[PDB]
Coordinates of C-alpha atoms and ligand atoms in Angstrom, one line a residue:
Chain A
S1 CA 0.0 0.0 0.0
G2 CA 0.8 3.7 -0.3
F3 CA 1.0 6.1 -3.2
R4 CA 3.7 8.6 -3.6
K5 CA 4.9 10.9 -6.3
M6 CA 7.6 8.7 -7.6
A7 CA 10.5 9.3 -10.0
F8 CA 12.4 6.7 -12.0
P9 CA 15.7 5.6 -10.5
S10 CA 18.1 8.4 -11.8
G11 CA 21.4 6.3 -11.9
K12 CA 21.5 5.8 -15.7
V13 CA 21.1 9.6 -16.1
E14 CA 23.6 10.6 -13.4
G15 CA 26.4 8.8 -15.2
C16 CA 25.7 11.2 -18.2
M17 CA 25.8 14.6 -16.4
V18 CA 28.7 16.9 -17.1
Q19 CA 29.5 20.5 -16.5
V20 CA 29.7 22.9 -19.5
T21 CA 31.5 26.2 -19.2
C22 CA 31.5 28.8 -22.0
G23 CA 33.2 32.0 -20.7
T24 CA 31.6 33.0 -17.4
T25 CA 28.5 30.8 -18.0
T26 CA 28.3 27.4 -16.3
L27 CA 25.5 24.9 -16.9
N28 CA 24.9 21.2 -17.4
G29 CA 25.4 18.9 -20.3
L30 CA 24.2 15.4 -21.2
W31 CA 27.1 13.2 -22.3
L32 CA 25.8 10.4 -24.5
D33 CA 28.3 8.4 -26.7
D34 CA 30.8 11.1 -27.9
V35 CA 28.4 14.0 -27.8
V36 CA 27.5 16.5 -25.0
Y37 CA 24.1 18.1 -25.4
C38 CA 23.4 21.4 -23.6
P39 CA 21.2 24.6 -24.1
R40 CA 22.6 26.7 -26.9
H41 CA 22.1 29.9 -24.7
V42 CA 25.4 28.8 -22.9
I43 CA 27.2 30.9 -25.6
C44 CA 25.2 34.1 -24.8
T45 CA 26.7 37.1 -22.9
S46 CA 24.6 39.8 -21.1
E47 CA 24.1 41.9 -24.3
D48 CA 23.6 38.7 -26.3
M49 CA 20.8 37.0 -24.3
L50 CA 18.6 40.1 -25.0
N51 CA 18.6 39.5 -28.8
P52 CA 21.0 36.7 -29.7
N53 CA 22.1 35.4 -33.1
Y54 CA 23.2 32.0 -32.2
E55 CA 24.7 31.2 -35.7
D56 CA 26.9 34.3 -35.3
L57 CA 27.8 33.7 -31.7
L58 CA 28.7 30.1 -32.4
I59 CA 30.8 30.8 -35.5
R60 CA 33.2 32.9 -33.3
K61 CA 33.7 30.0 -30.9
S62 CA 36.5 27.4 -31.1
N63 CA 36.4 23.9 -29.6
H64 CA 38.7 25.0 -26.7
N65 CA 36.2 27.8 -25.7
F66 CA 34.0 25.0 -24.3
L67 CA 35.3 23.5 -21.1
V68 CA 33.5 20.2 -20.5
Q69 CA 34.0 18.5 -17.2
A70 CA 32.9 15.0 -16.4
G71 CA 33.5 14.7 -12.6
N72 CA 37.1 15.9 -12.1
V73 CA 38.1 15.0 -15.7
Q74 CA 38.2 17.6 -18.4
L75 CA 36.7 16.2 -21.7
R76 CA 38.3 17.3 -24.9
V77 CA 35.9 19.1 -27.3
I78 CA 36.7 18.2 -30.9
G79 CA 33.6 19.7 -32.6
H80 CA 30.6 21.9 -32.1
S81 CA 27.2 22.1 -33.9
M82 CA 23.8 23.5 -33.3
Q83 CA 20.5 21.6 -33.7
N84 CA 17.6 24.0 -33.0
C85 CA 18.1 25.3 -29.4
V86 CA 20.6 22.6 -28.3
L87 CA 24.3 22.8 -28.8
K88 CA 26.1 19.5 -29.5
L89 CA 29.7 19.4 -28.4
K90 CA 31.5 16.5 -30.0
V91 CA 34.1 15.1 -27.6
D92 CA 37.1 12.8 -28.0
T93 CA 35.8 10.2 -25.5
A94 CA 32.6 8.1 -25.8
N95 CA 30.9 8.0 -22.4
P96 CA 31.5 4.5 -21.0
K97 CA 28.4 5.0 -18.8
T98 CA 26.1 5.6 -21.8
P99 CA 22.9 3.7 -21.2
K100 CA 20.5 2.4 -23.9
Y101 CA 18.7 5.6 -24.8
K102 CA 16.3 7.3 -27.2
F103 CA 15.3 11.0 -27.7
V104 CA 11.5 11.2 -27.5
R105 CA 9.3 14.3 -27.7
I106 CA 6.4 14.0 -25.2
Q107 CA 2.9 15.3 -25.3
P108 CA 1.2 17.5 -22.6
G109 CA -0.1 15.4 -19.7
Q110 CA 2.8 13.0 -19.9
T111 CA 5.0 12.7 -16.8
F112 CA 8.8 12.3 -16.5
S113 CA 11.5 12.4 -13.9
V114 CA 13.8 15.4 -13.7
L115 CA 17.3 15.1 -12.5
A116 CA 18.1 18.6 -11.3
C117 CA 21.9 19.4 -11.6
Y118 CA 24.3 22.2 -10.8
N119 CA 27.8 22.3 -12.1
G120 CA 27.4 18.9 -13.8
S121 CA 26.5 17.4 -10.4
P122 CA 23.1 15.8 -9.7
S123 CA 21.4 17.3 -6.6
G124 CA 17.9 15.9 -6.7
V125 CA 15.3 13.9 -8.6
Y126 CA 11.6 14.8 -8.9
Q127 CA 8.6 13.6 -10.9
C128 CA 6.6 16.2 -12.8
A129 CA 4.3 16.5 -15.9
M130 CA 4.4 18.5 -19.1
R131 CA 1.6 20.9 -18.4
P132 CA -1.1 21.5 -21.1
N133 CA 0.4 25.0 -21.4
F134 CA 3.8 23.3 -22.2
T135 CA 5.6 24.5 -19.1
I136 CA 6.7 22.3 -16.2
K137 CA 6.2 23.3 -12.6
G138 CA 9.7 22.3 -11.7
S139 CA 12.1 23.2 -8.9
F140 CA 15.1 24.9 -10.5
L141 CA 17.7 27.5 -9.4
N142 CA 20.4 29.4 -11.3
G143 CA 22.8 26.9 -13.1
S144 CA 20.1 24.2 -13.4
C145 CA 20.0 24.7 -17.3
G146 CA 20.9 21.5 -19.0
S147 CA 19.2 19.3 -16.4
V148 CA 17.1 16.6 -18.1
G149 CA 13.7 15.0 -18.0
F150 CA 13.5 11.3 -18.8
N151 CA 11.5 8.1 -18.5
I152 CA 12.7 4.5 -18.4
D153 CA 10.9 1.9 -20.4
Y154 CA 12.5 -1.5 -19.7
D155 CA 16.4 -1.1 -20.0
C156 CA 16.1 2.1 -22.1
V157 CA 16.2 5.8 -21.0
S158 CA 14.0 8.0 -23.1
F159 CA 15.2 11.6 -22.8
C160 CA 12.4 14.0 -23.2
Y161 CA 13.3 17.3 -21.7
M162 CA 16.2 19.6 -21.3
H163 CA 15.8 22.7 -19.1
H164 CA 16.5 26.1 -20.6
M165 CA 14.7 28.9 -18.6
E166 CA 12.3 30.1 -16.0
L167 CA 9.3 32.1 -16.9
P168 CA 8.2 35.1 -14.7
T169 CA 5.5 33.0 -12.9
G170 CA 8.1 30.6 -11.5
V171 CA 7.3 27.8 -14.0
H172 CA 10.0 26.4 -16.4
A173 CA 10.5 26.2 -20.1
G174 CA 12.6 23.7 -22.0
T175 CA 13.1 21.7 -25.1
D176 CA 13.2 18.0 -26.3
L177 CA 16.8 16.6 -26.8
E178 CA 16.6 17.7 -30.5
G179 CA 16.4 21.4 -29.3
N180 CA 12.7 22.0 -30.1
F181 CA 11.0 24.0 -27.3
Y182 CA 7.9 22.7 -25.7
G183 CA 5.4 25.5 -26.0
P184 CA 5.5 28.9 -27.6
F185 CA 8.8 29.9 -26.0
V186 CA 12.1 31.2 -27.4
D187 CA 15.5 31.2 -25.8
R188 CA 16.0 34.9 -25.2
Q189 CA 15.6 37.4 -22.4
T190 CA 12.3 38.9 -23.5
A191 CA 8.7 39.2 -22.3
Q192 CA 7.3 35.6 -22.4
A193 CA 4.3 34.3 -20.5
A194 CA 2.9 30.9 -19.9
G195 CA -0.7 30.5 -21.3
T196 CA -3.5 29.8 -18.8
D197 CA -3.0 26.3 -17.6
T198 CA -5.6 23.5 -17.5
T199 CA -5.9 20.3 -15.4
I200 CA -4.9 17.0 -17.0
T201 CA -8.3 15.1 -16.8
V202 CA -7.1 11.6 -17.8
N203 CA -4.4 11.9 -15.1
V204 CA -6.9 13.0 -12.4
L205 CA -9.1 10.0 -13.2
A206 CA -6.0 7.7 -13.1
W207 CA -5.2 9.2 -9.7
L208 CA -8.8 8.6 -8.5
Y209 CA -8.3 4.9 -9.6
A210 CA -5.1 4.8 -7.6
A211 CA -7.0 6.1 -4.5
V212 CA -9.6 3.3 -5.0
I213 CA -6.8 0.7 -5.3
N214 CA -5.5 2.1 -2.0
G215 CA -8.9 1.8 -0.2
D216 CA -10.2 5.4 -0.6
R217 CA -13.8 5.1 -1.9
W218 CA -15.6 8.0 -0.2
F219 CA -15.9 10.0 -3.5
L220 CA -17.5 7.1 -5.5
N221 CA -21.2 7.2 -6.3
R222 CA -23.9 5.2 -8.0
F223 CA -23.9 7.6 -11.0
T224 CA -22.5 7.6 -14.5
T225 CA -22.3 10.3 -17.3
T226 CA -22.0 10.5 -21.0
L227 CA -18.5 11.5 -22.4
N228 CA -20.2 14.6 -23.9
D229 CA -21.8 15.8 -20.6
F230 CA -18.5 15.2 -18.8
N231 CA -16.6 17.4 -21.3
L232 CA -19.2 20.1 -21.0
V233 CA -18.6 20.1 -17.2
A234 CA -14.8 19.7 -17.6
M235 CA -14.5 22.7 -20.0
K236 CA -16.2 24.8 -17.3
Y237 CA -13.6 23.9 -14.6
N238 CA -10.6 24.5 -16.9
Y239 CA -10.1 20.7 -17.4
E240 CA -8.5 19.3 -20.6
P241 CA -11.1 17.4 -22.8
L242 CA -11.4 13.7 -22.1
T243 CA -11.1 11.8 -25.4
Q244 CA -12.2 8.2 -26.2
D245 CA -8.4 7.5 -26.3
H246 CA -8.1 8.5 -22.6
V247 CA -11.2 6.3 -21.8
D248 CA -9.5 3.3 -23.5
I249 CA -6.2 4.0 -21.7
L250 CA -8.1 3.9 -18.4
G251 CA -9.6 0.5 -19.3
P252 CA -7.2 -1.7 -17.3
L253 CA -7.7 0.5 -14.1
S254 CA -11.5 0.4 -14.7
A255 CA -11.3 -3.4 -15.0
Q256 CA -9.2 -3.8 -11.9
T257 CA -11.3 -1.6 -9.6
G258 CA -14.8 -2.4 -11.1
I259 CA -15.5 1.3 -11.7
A260 CA -16.3 2.2 -15.4
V261 CA -14.4 5.3 -16.7
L262 CA -17.7 7.2 -17.1
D263 CA -18.6 6.0 -13.6
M264 CA -15.3 7.6 -12.3
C265 CA -16.1 10.8 -14.4
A266 CA -19.4 11.2 -12.5
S267 CA -17.3 11.1 -9.3
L268 CA -14.9 13.8 -10.7
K269 CA -17.9 15.8 -11.9
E270 CA -19.4 15.8 -8.4
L271 CA -15.9 16.7 -6.9
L272 CA -15.6 19.7 -9.3
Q273 CA -19.1 21.0 -8.5
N274 CA -19.2 20.2 -4.8
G275 CA -15.5 20.0 -3.7
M276 CA -13.9 17.6 -1.3
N277 CA -15.8 18.8 1.8
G278 CA -12.9 18.8 4.3
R279 CA -11.9 15.3 3.1
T280 CA -8.6 14.2 1.4
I281 CA -7.8 11.7 -1.4
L282 CA -4.4 10.1 -1.0
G283 CA -3.4 12.7 1.5
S284 CA -4.2 15.6 -0.9
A285 CA -7.0 18.2 -0.7
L286 CA -6.6 19.0 -4.5
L287 CA -7.3 16.8 -7.5
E288 CA -3.8 15.6 -8.4
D289 CA -3.0 15.5 -12.2
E290 CA 0.7 14.5 -12.4
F291 CA 0.2 10.7 -12.4
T292 CA -0.6 9.2 -15.8
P293 CA -2.7 5.9 -16.1
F294 CA 0.7 4.1 -16.8
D295 CA 2.2 5.7 -13.6
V296 CA -0.7 4.3 -11.6
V297 CA -0.3 0.8 -13.0
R298 CA 3.5 0.9 -12.7
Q299 CA 3.3 1.9 -9.0
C300 CA 0.3 -0.4 -8.1
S301 CA 2.1 -3.4 -9.8
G302 CA 5.8 -2.7 -9.0
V303 CA 7.5 -2.7 -12.4
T304 CA 11.3 -2.6 -11.9
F305 CA 14.3 -1.0 -13.9
Chain B
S1 CA 12.0 29.3 -8.2
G2 CA 9.6 26.4 -7.6
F3 CA 9.2 24.0 -4.7
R4 CA 8.8 20.3 -5.2
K5 CA 9.0 17.2 -3.1
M6 CA 12.5 16.2 -4.1
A7 CA 14.4 13.0 -3.6
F8 CA 18.2 12.6 -3.7
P9 CA 19.6 11.1 -7.0
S10 CA 19.4 7.3 -6.4
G11 CA 22.3 6.2 -8.5
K12 CA 24.7 5.6 -5.6
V13 CA 22.1 3.4 -3.9
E14 CA 21.0 1.6 -7.1
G15 CA 24.5 0.1 -7.5
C16 CA 24.1 -1.4 -4.0
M17 CA 20.7 -3.2 -4.5
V18 CA 20.9 -7.1 -4.5
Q19 CA 18.3 -9.8 -4.3
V20 CA 18.4 -12.1 -1.2
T21 CA 16.6 -15.5 -1.3
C22 CA 16.3 -17.8 1.6
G23 CA 14.1 -20.8 0.8
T24 CA 10.9 -19.6 -1.0
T25 CA 11.3 -16.0 0.4
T26 CA 12.9 -13.4 -1.7
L27 CA 13.6 -9.7 -0.8
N28 CA 16.2 -6.9 -1.2
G29 CA 19.6 -6.5 0.3
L30 CA 22.0 -3.6 0.5
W31 CA 25.5 -4.6 -0.7
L32 CA 28.2 -2.4 0.9
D33 CA 31.8 -3.5 0.8
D34 CA 31.8 -7.3 1.3
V35 CA 28.5 -7.3 3.4
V36 CA 24.9 -7.6 2.3
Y37 CA 22.3 -6.2 4.8
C38 CA 18.7 -7.4 4.7
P39 CA 15.8 -7.8 7.1
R40 CA 16.3 -10.8 9.3
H41 CA 12.7 -12.0 8.7
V42 CA 14.0 -13.4 5.3
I43 CA 14.8 -16.6 7.3
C44 CA 11.1 -17.0 8.6
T45 CA 9.0 -19.8 7.4
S46 CA 5.1 -19.6 6.8
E47 CA 4.6 -21.6 10.0
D48 CA 6.8 -19.0 11.9
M49 CA 6.1 -15.2 11.5
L50 CA 4.0 -15.0 14.7
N51 CA 6.7 -15.9 17.2
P52 CA 10.0 -16.5 15.4
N53 CA 13.2 -17.2 17.4
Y54 CA 15.7 -15.7 15.0
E55 CA 18.7 -16.9 16.9
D56 CA 17.3 -20.5 16.6
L57 CA 16.3 -20.1 12.9
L58 CA 19.7 -18.6 12.0
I59 CA 21.8 -21.3 13.8
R60 CA 20.2 -23.9 11.4
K61 CA 21.3 -22.0 8.3
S62 CA 24.4 -22.5 6.4
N63 CA 26.1 -19.9 4.0
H64 CA 24.8 -21.8 0.9
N65 CA 21.2 -21.5 2.2
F66 CA 21.4 -17.7 1.3
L67 CA 21.2 -17.1 -2.5
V68 CA 22.5 -13.5 -3.1
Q69 CA 22.1 -12.2 -6.7
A70 CA 23.6 -8.9 -7.9
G71 CA 22.3 -8.4 -11.4
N72 CA 22.9 -11.7 -13.2
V73 CA 25.8 -12.6 -10.9
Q74 CA 25.3 -15.0 -8.0
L75 CA 27.4 -13.6 -5.0
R76 CA 29.0 -16.3 -2.8
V77 CA 28.0 -16.0 0.9
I78 CA 31.0 -16.8 3.1
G79 CA 29.5 -15.7 6.5
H80 CA 26.3 -14.8 8.3
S81 CA 25.5 -12.8 11.5
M82 CA 22.6 -11.0 13.0
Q83 CA 22.7 -7.5 14.4
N84 CA 19.3 -6.7 16.0
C85 CA 16.7 -7.1 13.2
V86 CA 19.1 -7.1 10.3
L87 CA 20.9 -10.0 8.8
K88 CA 24.5 -9.4 7.6
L89 CA 25.6 -11.7 4.9
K90 CA 29.4 -11.6 4.4
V91 CA 30.1 -12.2 0.7
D92 CA 33.3 -13.1 -1.3
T93 CA 33.2 -9.9 -3.3
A94 CA 33.4 -6.3 -2.2
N95 CA 30.9 -4.2 -4.2
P96 CA 32.9 -2.1 -6.7
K97 CA 30.1 0.4 -6.7
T98 CA 30.2 1.0 -2.9
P99 CA 29.8 4.7 -2.4
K100 CA 31.1 6.8 0.5
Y101 CA 28.5 5.9 3.1
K102 CA 27.5 6.1 6.8
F103 CA 24.7 4.5 8.9
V104 CA 22.7 7.1 10.6
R105 CA 19.6 6.7 12.9
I106 CA 17.2 9.5 12.3
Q107 CA 14.6 11.2 14.5
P108 CA 10.9 11.7 13.8
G109 CA 10.3 14.6 11.4
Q110 CA 13.4 13.8 9.5
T111 CA 13.1 13.3 5.7
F112 CA 14.9 10.8 3.4
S113 CA 14.7 9.4 0.0
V114 CA 13.4 5.8 -0.5
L115 CA 14.6 3.7 -3.4
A116 CA 11.8 1.2 -3.7
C117 CA 13.1 -2.2 -5.0
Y118 CA 11.7 -5.6 -6.0
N119 CA 13.8 -8.6 -6.6
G120 CA 17.0 -6.5 -6.0
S121 CA 15.9 -4.2 -8.8
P122 CA 15.1 -0.5 -8.2
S123 CA 11.6 0.5 -9.5
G124 CA 11.2 4.0 -8.1
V125 CA 12.4 6.8 -5.9
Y126 CA 10.4 9.0 -3.6
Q127 CA 10.7 11.4 -0.7
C128 CA 9.2 10.8 2.7
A129 CA 9.5 11.6 6.4
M130 CA 9.8 9.5 9.5
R131 CA 6.4 10.3 11.1
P132 CA 6.2 11.2 14.8
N133 CA 4.6 7.8 15.4
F134 CA 7.8 6.2 13.9
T135 CA 6.1 4.8 10.8
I136 CA 6.7 6.0 7.2
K137 CA 3.8 6.6 4.8
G138 CA 5.6 4.9 2.0
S139 CA 4.6 3.2 -1.3
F140 CA 5.6 -0.4 -0.9
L141 CA 4.2 -3.6 -2.3
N142 CA 5.0 -7.3 -1.5
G143 CA 8.8 -8.0 -1.8
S144 CA 9.7 -4.4 -1.1
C145 CA 11.4 -5.5 2.2
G146 CA 15.1 -4.5 2.2
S147 CA 14.4 -1.2 0.2
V148 CA 16.3 1.6 1.9
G149 CA 15.9 5.2 3.0
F150 CA 18.9 7.5 2.6
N151 CA 20.1 11.0 2.3
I152 CA 23.1 12.1 0.1
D153 CA 24.6 15.2 1.6
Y154 CA 28.0 16.0 0.0
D155 CA 28.8 12.7 -2.0
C156 CA 28.3 10.6 1.2
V157 CA 25.2 8.4 1.3
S158 CA 23.8 8.3 4.9
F159 CA 21.6 5.1 5.1
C160 CA 18.9 5.7 7.6
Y161 CA 16.1 3.2 6.9
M162 CA 15.6 -0.4 5.8
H163 CA 12.0 -1.4 5.1
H164 CA 10.8 -4.4 7.1
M165 CA 7.0 -4.5 7.1
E166 CA 3.6 -2.9 6.5
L167 CA 1.3 -2.2 9.5
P168 CA -2.5 -2.9 9.1
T169 CA -3.2 0.8 8.4
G170 CA -1.2 0.8 5.2
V171 CA 1.8 2.6 6.8
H172 CA 5.3 1.1 7.0
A173 CA 7.7 0.1 9.7
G174 CA 11.5 -0.6 9.4
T175 CA 14.8 -0.2 11.1
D176 CA 18.0 1.8 10.9
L177 CA 20.9 -0.1 9.2
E178 CA 22.0 -1.5 12.6
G179 CA 18.7 -3.4 12.8
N180 CA 17.1 -1.3 15.5
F181 CA 13.5 -0.7 14.7
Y182 CA 12.0 2.8 14.6
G183 CA 9.0 2.9 17.0
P184 CA 7.5 0.2 19.2
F185 CA 7.5 -2.3 16.5
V186 CA 8.7 -5.9 16.2
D187 CA 9.4 -8.1 13.3
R188 CA 6.6 -10.6 14.1
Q189 CA 3.0 -10.8 12.6
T190 CA 1.5 -10.1 16.0
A191 CA -1.1 -7.4 16.6
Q192 CA 0.8 -4.2 16.1
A193 CA -0.8 -0.7 15.7
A194 CA 0.8 2.6 14.8
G195 CA 0.1 5.2 17.5
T196 CA -2.1 8.2 16.4
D197 CA -0.1 10.3 13.9
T198 CA 0.5 14.0 14.3
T199 CA 1.7 16.8 12.1
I200 CA 5.4 17.7 12.1
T201 CA 5.1 21.4 13.2
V202 CA 8.7 22.5 12.6
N203 CA 8.4 21.1 9.1
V204 CA 5.1 23.0 8.4
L205 CA 6.7 26.2 9.6
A206 CA 9.8 25.5 7.4
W207 CA 7.4 25.0 4.4
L208 CA 5.7 28.3 5.2
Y209 CA 9.1 29.9 5.1
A210 CA 9.7 28.2 1.7
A211 CA 6.4 29.7 0.5
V212 CA 7.5 33.2 1.6
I213 CA 10.9 32.8 -0.1
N214 CA 8.9 31.9 -3.3
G215 CA 6.7 35.0 -3.0
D216 CA 3.6 33.7 -1.3
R217 CA 2.6 35.9 1.7
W218 CA -1.2 35.8 1.7
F219 CA -1.2 33.7 5.0
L220 CA 1.0 36.1 7.0
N221 CA -0.6 38.3 9.7
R222 CA 0.2 41.2 12.0
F223 CA 0.2 38.9 15.1
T224 CA 2.8 37.0 17.1
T225 CA 2.4 34.4 19.8
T226 CA 4.2 33.0 22.8
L227 CA 5.8 29.6 22.3
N228 CA 3.4 28.2 25.0
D229 CA 0.1 29.7 23.5
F230 CA 1.2 28.3 20.1
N231 CA 1.6 24.8 21.5
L232 CA -1.7 25.0 23.3
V233 CA -3.5 25.7 20.0
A234 CA -1.2 23.3 18.0
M235 CA -1.9 20.2 20.2
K236 CA -5.7 20.8 19.5
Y237 CA -5.1 20.2 15.7
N238 CA -2.9 17.1 16.4
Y239 CA 0.3 19.1 15.8
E240 CA 3.6 18.0 17.4
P241 CA 4.8 20.4 20.2
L242 CA 7.2 23.0 18.9
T243 CA 10.3 23.1 21.1
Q244 CA 12.9 25.9 21.6
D245 CA 15.2 23.6 19.5
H246 CA 12.8 23.8 16.6
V247 CA 12.6 27.6 17.0
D248 CA 16.4 27.8 16.9
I249 CA 16.5 25.6 13.9
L250 CA 14.1 28.0 12.0
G251 CA 16.5 30.9 12.8
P252 CA 18.3 31.0 9.4
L253 CA 14.9 31.0 7.6
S254 CA 13.5 33.6 9.9
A255 CA 16.6 35.8 9.2
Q256 CA 16.4 35.3 5.4
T257 CA 12.7 36.2 5.2
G258 CA 12.5 38.8 8.0
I259 CA 9.6 36.9 9.7
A260 CA 10.3 35.9 13.3
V261 CA 9.6 32.3 14.2
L262 CA 6.8 33.3 16.6
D263 CA 5.3 35.5 13.9
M264 CA 5.2 32.6 11.5
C265 CA 3.8 30.5 14.4
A266 CA 0.9 33.1 14.5
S267 CA 0.3 32.6 10.7
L268 CA 0.2 28.8 11.3
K269 CA -2.4 29.3 14.2
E270 CA -4.5 31.4 11.8
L271 CA -4.2 28.9 9.0
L272 CA -5.2 26.1 11.4
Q273 CA -8.3 28.2 12.4
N274 CA -9.4 29.4 9.0
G275 CA -8.1 26.8 6.6
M276 CA -6.9 28.1 3.2
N277 CA -10.2 29.4 1.9
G278 CA -9.8 28.2 -1.6
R279 CA -6.2 29.4 -1.8
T280 CA -3.0 27.2 -2.1
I281 CA 0.4 27.5 -0.6
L282 CA 3.2 26.2 -2.9
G283 CA 0.5 24.3 -5.0
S284 CA -0.9 22.6 -2.0
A285 CA -4.3 22.9 -0.3
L286 CA -3.0 21.2 2.9
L287 CA -0.2 22.2 5.3
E288 CA 2.8 20.2 4.1
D289 CA 5.0 18.6 6.8
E290 CA 7.5 16.4 4.9
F291 CA 10.0 19.3 4.2
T292 CA 12.5 19.9 7.0
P293 CA 14.2 23.3 7.7
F294 CA 17.4 21.8 6.1
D295 CA 15.4 20.7 3.0
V296 CA 14.0 24.2 2.5
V297 CA 17.4 25.8 2.7
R298 CA 19.0 23.2 0.3
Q299 CA 16.2 23.5 -2.2
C300 CA 16.0 27.4 -2.0
Ligands
QCO1 C1 6.8 -9.6 10.3 C2 7.6 -10.5 9.5 C3 8.0 -11.8 10.2 O1 6.8 -11.0 8.4 C4 6.7 -10.3 7.2 C5 5.9 -10.9 6.2 C6 5.6 -10.3 5.0 C7 6.2 -9.0 4.8 N1 5.8 -8.4 3.5 C8 6.4 -8.7 2.3 O2 5.9 -8.4 1.3 C9 7.6 -9.6 2.2 C10 8.2 -10.4 3.1 N2 9.2 -11.0 2.5 C11 9.2 -10.6 1.2 N3 8.2 -9.7 1.0 C12 4.7 -7.5 3.5 C13 4.0 -7.2 4.9 O3 4.5 -6.4 5.7 N4 3.0 -8.0 5.2 C14 2.2 -7.9 6.5 C15 2.9 -8.7 7.6 C16 2.2 -8.6 8.9 C17 1.0 -9.3 9.1 C18 0.3 -9.1 10.3 C19 0.7 -8.2 11.3 C20 1.9 -7.5 11.0 F1 2.3 -6.7 12.0 C21 2.6 -7.7 9.9 C22 4.8 -6.2 2.8 C23 3.8 -5.7 2.0 C24 3.8 -4.4 1.5 C25 4.9 -3.6 1.8 N5 6.0 -4.1 2.5 C26 5.9 -5.3 2.9 C27 7.0 -8.4 5.7 C28 7.2 -9.0 6.9
CL2 CL1 11.5 -19.6 3.9
CL3 CL1 -12.2 24.9 10.3

């Protein structure tokens, strides 16, 4: 029993974190095979971050301008290229700790583990979700840039996020490992705002199933709803629309608990209109939306990596 | 900016997880140097469990009765001894991935990361606190026994918890790495109940300081309180007494934010009285108590 916000074991990713220094700027890099990936803004100065021409800033750099440190060992940079907003520093040594990996771009609602790093050194691991507004509500300080988001599927680390910046509201913006930003963000010091966020409905339902699996049934009721009437209620409370795909994904949890997906929607509908009434679900007074249906199954079945 | 429940990177602990099998029972072990530590209940039979005599059960075991597996490699057990409720299996190979480590016994309110494991294989990492009633509100399924709680301050892993069992209420009981159980619990299937749980007051105050450092001040008020009047109101909401030690520990956060501890104590009293009124503090509608003053400072 028990349900916690749980991250993947970060060991495979820790053995990839390196420190990248370019001038006075220090951030993190991800060393996979003979390449180090890091945010391209590492080459910006104070005047540059305001309106940077990265092609022009990069052309002025030599390989030796990039100090890459893996622990206490300086890695030799033998090449440098840019792919979208990520800088790829070709190094003389292939990382002997390179796990089986893939670069995957995730969709809003999907969760991943973040290995927060400072000066190429992992300091913490947390689980978070790609918000529908494409930001992550992370925990990052100065120097965390280059810290990565990942999942593990079997023996393979799927890298899905690289941290780049913090928006004025305290939320974070980043890219996939191919340098494409999630969301309508750009890598420059300019006025940028996160769009109004919405709740990840399929994830709330998955978390309600996790609460039932853990013995919390107070919120259940005899009622059901149509998928259409639920989306009409959900749109009112800034919830993401629930699709037939989401209903199908919740199938195994519905089968395990004996509560049809539309039966759990009527519970969620009642919780949105009436509230929790002083009660808690899994030790929370809010409807938690950062556990996917797969996260619930993984944690309630003990899949190992 | 931002404040999350944050676990330590589990890599140093992952390279220590091994599977320990004794008969039909399989659980996790912690391989440090040439020793594997695991719960001593691994030697219990189905007919035992209620009143096992571990000294008698262990004396009947040979080294080859303990199958220790590190990945796909069977480790050879060359010795076995018991220290309180932990079994120490001496092996013929020192773990090459042994980090700098220490065994530390923690006090209630202290937090740590748990690397949940099944069959010697890490499946997840989460943060949790040693509750005032000495249980942990973990996430553990069958075969999680032997999974450890740890902190990693400055490259050294301080091991503070080894999972032993789940109490009837769904909470968990375990020991330090010297086998001494936290709380009035025993490694027998006898009737055992966790004492009524209480909120870790110093941790709630530390989290209120974290919210102020992150720009959230709505809950603050013009009032202060005496330490005594605070504790009189706190005990009524099942909050742990706040000691002068706790007030001193909150000193650096009080200095950083400019809010005296007893001033923050008055915001807490008001919060307890009024609730949040539809508002949230650091994305939570409850008063969070699994962040210590030390966690707040490290994360901020
Ligand atoms: C007390 C000792 C002699 O017996 C134990 C027997 C089983 C376990 N458990 C194991 O899964 C396990 C043991 N070996 C491999 N796996 C689970 C447990 O705790 N069950 C309940 C046992 C109990 C039954 C009545 C009363 C009590 F006080 C305890 C478990 C479940 C969830 C999370 N963690 C663990 C632990 C100790
Ligand atoms: Cl047995
Ligand atoms: Cl009230």
